[PDB]
Enzyme design. Structure first.
Site, short mmCIF file in Angstrom:
data_model
loop_
_atom_site.label_atom_id
_atom_site.label_comp_id
_atom_site.label_asym_id
_atom_site.label_seq_id
_atom_site.Cartn_x
_atom_site.Cartn_y
_atom_site.Cartn_z
N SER A 170 0.81 -1.21 0.00
CA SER A 170 0.00 0.00 0.00
C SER A 170 0.85 1.26 0.00
O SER A 170 1.60 1.52 0.94
CB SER A 170 -0.92 0.02 1.21
N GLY A 171 0.71 2.07 -1.05
CA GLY A 171 1.48 3.30 -1.11
C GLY A 171 2.72 3.05 -1.93
O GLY A 171 3.64 3.87 -2.00
N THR A 175 -1.99 2.24 -7.73
CA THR A 175 -2.95 3.25 -8.16
C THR A 175 -2.25 4.49 -8.71
O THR A 175 -2.73 5.61 -8.55
CB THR A 175 -3.87 3.69 -7.01
N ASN A 219 -0.31 5.97 3.37
CA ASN A 219 -0.40 6.73 2.14
C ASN A 219 -1.49 7.80 2.10
O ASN A 219 -2.67 7.52 2.33
CB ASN A 219 -0.55 5.72 1.00
N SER A 222 -4.64 6.84 -0.44
CA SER A 222 -4.84 5.42 -0.47
C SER A 222 -6.11 5.13 -1.21
O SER A 222 -7.11 5.82 -1.05
CB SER A 222 -4.94 4.89 0.95
N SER A 223 -6.08 4.11 -2.04
CA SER A 223 -7.26 3.78 -2.79
C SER A 223 -8.10 2.82 -1.98
O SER A 223 -7.76 1.65 -1.85
CB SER A 223 -6.87 3.18 -4.13
N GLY A 435 -4.14 -5.73 -1.76
CA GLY A 435 -3.65 -7.09 -1.57
C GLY A 435 -3.83 -7.74 -0.22
O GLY A 435 -4.30 -7.11 0.73
N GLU A 437 -3.97 -8.46 3.04
CA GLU A 437 -3.61 -7.68 4.21
C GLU A 437 -4.00 -8.48 5.43
O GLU A 437 -5.12 -9.00 5.50
CB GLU A 437 -4.35 -6.34 4.20
N1 ADP Z 1 5.55 6.88 -10.18
C1 ADP Z 1 5.36 7.73 -9.18
N2 ADP Z 1 5.75 9.04 -9.29
C2 ADP Z 1 5.55 9.87 -8.26
N3 ADP Z 1 5.00 9.61 -7.07
C3 ADP Z 1 4.60 8.26 -6.98
C4 ADP Z 1 4.75 7.30 -7.96
N4 ADP Z 1 4.27 6.06 -7.55
C5 ADP Z 1 3.82 6.32 -6.36
N5 ADP Z 1 4.02 7.64 -5.94
C6 ADP Z 1 3.79 8.26 -4.59
O1 ADP Z 1 3.25 7.28 -3.67
C7 ADP Z 1 1.88 7.57 -3.29
C8 ADP Z 1 1.15 6.32 -3.20
O2 ADP Z 1 0.90 5.78 -4.55
P1 ADP Z 1 -0.35 4.95 -5.09
O3 ADP Z 1 -0.16 4.69 -6.50
O4 ADP Z 1 -1.55 5.73 -4.84
O5 ADP Z 1 -0.31 3.59 -4.22
P2 ADP Z 1 -1.26 2.36 -4.18
O6 ADP Z 1 -2.36 2.50 -5.12
O7 ADP Z 1 -0.23 1.33 -4.52
O8 ADP Z 1 -1.83 2.04 -2.76
C9 ADP Z 1 1.43 8.57 -4.34
O9 ADP Z 1 0.42 9.38 -3.75
C10 ADP Z 1 2.72 9.31 -4.62
O10 ADP Z 1 3.04 10.34 -3.67
MG MG Z 2 -4.07 3.02 -4.45
#
Ligand code: ADP
Ligand code: MG
Ligand code: PDM
Ligand code: CA
Ligand code: MG
Lengths: 777, 142, 153
Positions: A170-171, A175, A219, A222-223, A435, A437
């Protein structure tokens, strides 16, 4: 390669990359850096002493916990499948190396790792896109982009469906790179108030994200829900259309926040005062920290401007096709919740001053509502009484349900704006879902998220056993003693097939008793003791109470059935429903129109999802989170290793292998009569009386089946130590022989000196001698 | 043994008091009763029965020779010890030989072990087999 | 099975170890094995005790007639072949060039398998005249040949 902005974006090796001996160079464990580069100094059995290359210090390390280092020949590689050593230590390296240099991608073989930047990178630009367009994964450096191409490419020419499932913690990046994959695939295959289908598809994120995303310590954004967007292409390989499908919104957050978290972004931006000309449309007072439902945790995520993310949100509606009507409605119903939250009240109504805002917003009456919320109805048809709680949590459920029913409208609505009927032929459906958790405390919330993953963990495994068969034949072996996979269906069946807890909590919700042992038992009496996965709780860190315990792929998890029935259906005052159902608001009314529990609804949402994916040729992107602190370019030693052990590092009950070479250089001492790389090993087993099914002799390596290897290791260690004893009895027997002539002579010596003395006494005791001596002058 | 005979003779005479050219039953009970604690009767009688005919000098050295017939020399002995002196120190730390002699070879019995050290030459733990041999068999005094 | 004389070599020898604790017609169980090495064998300790060995001198005494069988016993047991030893030692030679450091060798012999008193090692290292080089390593090959070579080549 020549180079415009492939720079601090792709490989970058002429302006950086310019003494090694794999016999003293190796990796030892380090409590700080996970592993550490060092040189071997001495040996003493299981006590290989070494100097830490770095700080040039000294320590001992078991000959085992040491791990081979890769020659500098493979530094910052781009397909860690090529490295000489694809082990646990070296993989952490090659990624951290790249990561510190800002390459944020890597193909460890048939995967596409992606360490999160936590920094904005310049590698998704149109220029860069086109430099990646149409190109084979090899003529171009690693980068999410080409991960998507090869999909479209194959989609077009292989005429099939393609799926890129991005999965991480996560994070991590899920997403995120999910969006890039849509945005890219749409920069390349374009087709041509309401905006462009391209624009819409894309713009349809700040909305879904606005309502379905919130701050989590882990995060900021977070989605809270799953997502699975498909993208169909016309008979000319053009975007013909897309359709979304959200999974498992986190209803519970709408009214509660653990400290340090926020409610779904929107709420906070709704009070942002971005579009002041709406404060009065929603009746909101631009202040987040004033409504109980959103201000329980933190009220602001650093580096997330609400006012803006609000304006941008709105904009998005315009482009999806939303009207001023629909649009503002959304907001209103959303705004209302804030207030549904403020309705103050053992005691009954304490003022109604706010309950009215809710009354006005949803377009129904203050009276009817405020009334039904205390004296509702129902084969007999009655009227019931509700108390201080039989009402507050009755409101809680109102809101949640609304927000939920709403969210679905938002998706459904969005799937309409891109439902254009252009002819469809294949699709590229990215999937961004959380995933497995396993918190300290786990409920129905978790059983879902996880169960969902269980089925996904079988998709990956189905597809991995496939390439398996493709390694089994190149180095030519058919080796089908397939027998496997059952253990994964085991937990799968116990979770979705008829008699599993998943139809029980569903028919045991039809049965009108609906009490927690009426179910916390129905299972037991049906699966308690009658399963390998299902078992009574265990006995560890700081975990809460847990009833049944599942054997998930990732492992055993404790679950609490407390209040599942409720959590499963929708316990809103059926009274208010119809009150709403019949309303002067086009939305609310729709939202409550004329099975569906949270899970027979998931049963399909998921049965469906799979059937899609299994019609695709998948592509995996493994996002990895570098550190907790969140600063870009840093690596939490352990954290990474941890992740690298749960995806693809290379497994689950498959036969292991060894280049015929190394099998000799390890297990020859086991069958000692030999003196050709592969024939040396080719012999040993034969003589070792090896049962022929336990293995197959493909041309590059040897494939063993269980612990057949472990049985070797075990045999080896038993043997190695016998020889050692033998060589010792040889030293031992040598001595006993050196000291054998001194042994014999002495026996002559100790015979001369006994006999003589044993005479010299008799003589001193001889009457004559005595005499003789007395006379001796 | 050539010049040991010079003594036997010496002894014979100083023994043969009445000098009846023969060593008589009363010839011993005399010379003995003269120096130390003389033997008994059967003691004497068994001393004579140990010699075929009357005790002329011949018959004298005769009974003696047999009594020294199977002794190894001062070398076959003094070196039989030294086999255990590893160091060539002219000594066997006492306890070693004390144990060698008693709980090995044909085990030396208690009293058998007692009389052999009654006067044996022992020093700072060591044991001079070199001397003990030059005593057991032969040289240095008279 | 043994030949008469083989039984004679046992006959000869046995009548020495009997002597040393006392000619009484028996041999201390402790020495039972230590006696078989005087016949060009190298039965591991586990073997000797397996047939009647003893760990402390003075627990059981064994007469010839009894002995002999115990011997035929310690015969069918495995003896090491150059390769084995080499393929074992080799499992300690990383550089590959074939040198096993001094201390390690001491370790192996005094730490692994049935161990050795530092003495023996220190002895067997003198007898065979093993030599460490300036860096401090000895070629195990050379040492292994000597141990198998016997004290009298
Ligand atoms: N490719 C990227 N470029 C810049 N920041 C990113 C990138 N991937 C992730 N981040 C940073 O990490 C945070 C969490 O990402 P996110 O894609 O929302 O995670 P997830 O969906 O895996 O839970 C984003 O809000 C951002 O600050
Ligand atoms: Mg997400
Ligand atoms: C990571 C969990 C972790 O890293 N450990 C394991 C994950 C998965 C497995 N499996 C499978 O998934 C299939 C077979 C198997 O053993 C084992 C360990 C996580 O937290 O997501
Ligand atoms: Ca004896
Ligand atoms: Mg006279």
């Amino acid at each position: 390669f020549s180079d415009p902005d492939f720079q601090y974006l792709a490989v970058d090796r002429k302006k950086l990359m310019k003494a090694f001996d794999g016999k003293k160079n190796c990796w030892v464990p380090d409590e700080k850096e996970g592993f550490a580069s060092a040189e071997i100094q001495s040996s003493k059995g299981d006590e290989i002493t070494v100097k830490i290359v770095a700080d040039s210090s000294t320590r001992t390390v078991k000959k085992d916990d040491i791990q081979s280092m890769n020659p500098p020949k493979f530094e910052k590689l781009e397909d860690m499948a090529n490295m000489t050593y694809l082990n646990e230590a070296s993989v952490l390296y090659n990624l951290r190396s790249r990561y510190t240099s800002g390459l944020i991608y890597t193909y460890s073989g048939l995967f596409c790792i992606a360490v999160n930047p936590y920094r904005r990178l310049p590698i998704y630009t149109d220029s860069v896109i086109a430099k990646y367009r149409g190109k084979r994964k090899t003529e171009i450096p690693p980068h999410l982009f080409s991960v998507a191409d090869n999909a479209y490419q194959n989609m077009v020419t292989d005429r099939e469906n393609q799926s890129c499932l991005i999965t991480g913690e996560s994070g991590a990046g899920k997403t995120e790179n999910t969006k890039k994959v849509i945005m890219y695939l749409a920069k390349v295959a374009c087709a041509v108030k309401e905006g462009s289908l391209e624009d819409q598809i894309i713009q349809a994120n700040p909305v879904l994200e606005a309502y379905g995303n919130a701050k989590t310590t882990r995060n900021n954004n977070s989605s809270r829900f799953g997502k699975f967007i498909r993208i169909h292409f016309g008979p000319t390989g053009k975007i013909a259309g897309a359709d979304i499908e959200t999974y498992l919104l986190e209803k519970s957050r709408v009214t509660y926040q653990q400290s340090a978290e926020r409610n779904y972004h929107i709420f906070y931006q709704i009070c942002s005062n971005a579009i002041p000309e709406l404060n009065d449309v929603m009746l909101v007072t631009p202040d987040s920290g004033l409504y109980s439902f959103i201000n329980q945790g933190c009220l602001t995520v650093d580096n997330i401007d609400d006012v803006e993310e609000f304006k941008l949100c709105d904009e998005a509606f315009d482009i999806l096709g939303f009207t001023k009507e629909e649009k503002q409605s959304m907001f209103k119903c959303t705004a209302s919740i804030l207030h549904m939250g403020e309705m103050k009240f053992q005691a009954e109504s304490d003022g109604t001053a706010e309950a009215e805002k809710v009354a006005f917003l949803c377009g129904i009456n203050a009276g009817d509502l405020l009334k039904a919320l205390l004296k509702p109805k129902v084969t007999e048809m009655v009227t019931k009484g509700q108390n201080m709680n039989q009402v507050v949590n009755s409101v809680g459920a109102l809101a949640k349900s609304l927000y939920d029913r709403m969210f679905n409208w938002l998706v459904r609505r969005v799937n309409k704006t891109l439902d254009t009927k252009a002819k469809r032929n294949y699709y590229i459906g990215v999937l961004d879902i959380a995933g497995f958790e396993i918190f300290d405390f786990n409920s129905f919330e978790q059983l879902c998220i996880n169960y969902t993953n269980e089925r996904l963990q079988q998709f990956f495994n189905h597809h991995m056993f496939i390439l398996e068969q493709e390694e089994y034949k190149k180095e030519g072996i058919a080796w089908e003693f397939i027998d496997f996979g059952m253990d994964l269906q085991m937990c799968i069946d116990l979770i979705e097939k008829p008699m599993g807890i998943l139809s029980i909590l569903e028919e045991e919700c039809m049965f009108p008793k609906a009490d927690d042992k009426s179910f916390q038992d129905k299972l037991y009496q049906n699966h308690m003791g009658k399963n390998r996965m299902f078992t009574k709780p265990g006995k560890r860190p700081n975990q809460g109470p847990a009833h049944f315990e599942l054997h998930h792929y990732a492992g055993n998890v404790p679950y609490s059935i407390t209040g599942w029935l409720e959590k499963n259906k929708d316990p809103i005052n059926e009274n208010v429903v119809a009150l709403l159902g019949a309303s002067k608001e086009p939305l609310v009314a729709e939202l409550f129109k004329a099975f569906q529990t949270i899970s027979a609804v998931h049963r399909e949402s998921l049965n469906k999802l799979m059937k899609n994916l299994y019609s695709t040729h998948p592509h995996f992107v493994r996002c990895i989170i570098p550190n907790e602190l969140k600063q870009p370019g840093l690596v939490d030693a352990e954290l990474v290793l941890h992740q690298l052990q749960c995806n693809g590092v290379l497994r689950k009950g498959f036969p292991s292998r060894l280049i015929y070479s190394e099998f000799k250089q390890r297990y020859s001492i086991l069958a000692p009569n030999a003196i050709d790389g592969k024939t040396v090993s080719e012999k040993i087993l034969a003589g070792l009386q090896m049962d022929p099914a336990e293995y197959r002799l493909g041309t590059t390596k040897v494939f063993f089946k269980a612990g057949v290897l472990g049985n070797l290791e075990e045999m080896r260690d038993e043997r190695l130590s016998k020889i050692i004893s033998m060589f010792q009895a040889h030293i031992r027997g040598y001595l006993i022989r050196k000291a054998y002539k001194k042994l014999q002579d002495q026996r002559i010596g100790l015979s001369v000196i006994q006999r003589n003395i044993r005479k010299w006494l008799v003589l001193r005791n001889w009457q004559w001698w005595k005499l003789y001596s007395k006379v001796k002058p | 043994p050539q010049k040991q005979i010079q003594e036997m003779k010496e002894a014979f005479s100083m023994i043969d008091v009445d000098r009846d050219g023969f060593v008589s039953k009363e010839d011993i009970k005399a010379i003995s009763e003269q120096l130390g604690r003389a033997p008994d009767d059967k003691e004497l009688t068994a001393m004579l029965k140990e010699a075929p005919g009357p005790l002329n000098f011949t018959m004298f050295l005769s009974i003696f020779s047999d009594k020294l017939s199977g002794t190894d020399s001062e070398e076959t002995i003094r070196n039989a010890f030294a086999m255990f002196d590893e160091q060539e120190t002219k000594k066997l730390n006492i306890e070693y030989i004390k144990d060698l002699l008693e709980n090995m070879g044909d085990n030396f019995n208690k009293d058998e072990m007692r009389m052999t050290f009654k006067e044996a030459p022992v020093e700072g733990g060591k044991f001079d087999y070199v001397k003990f041999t030059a005593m057991i068999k032969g040289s240095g005094e008279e | 099975k043994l030949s008469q004389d083989e039984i004679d070599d046992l006959k000869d020898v046995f009548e020495l170890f009997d002597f040393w604790d006392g000619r009484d017609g028996a041999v201390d169980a402790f020495k039972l094995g230590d006696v078989c090495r005087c016949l060009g064998i190298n039965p591991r300790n586990e073997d000797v005790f397996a047939v009647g060995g003893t760990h402390k001198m003075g627990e059981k005494s064994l007469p010839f007639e009894e002995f002999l069988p115990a011997y035929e016993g310690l015969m069918d047991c495995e003896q090491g072949t150059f390769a084995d030893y080499m393929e074992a030692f080799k499992t300690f030679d990383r550089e590959g060039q074939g040198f096993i450091s001094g201390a390690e060798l001491r370790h192996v012999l005094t730490a692994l398998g049935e161990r050795l008193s530092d003495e023996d090692v220190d002895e067997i290292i003198k007898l065979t005249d093993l030599q460490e080089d300036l860096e401090g390593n000895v070629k195990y090959e050379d040492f292994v040949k000597k141990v198998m070579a016997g004290p009298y080549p």
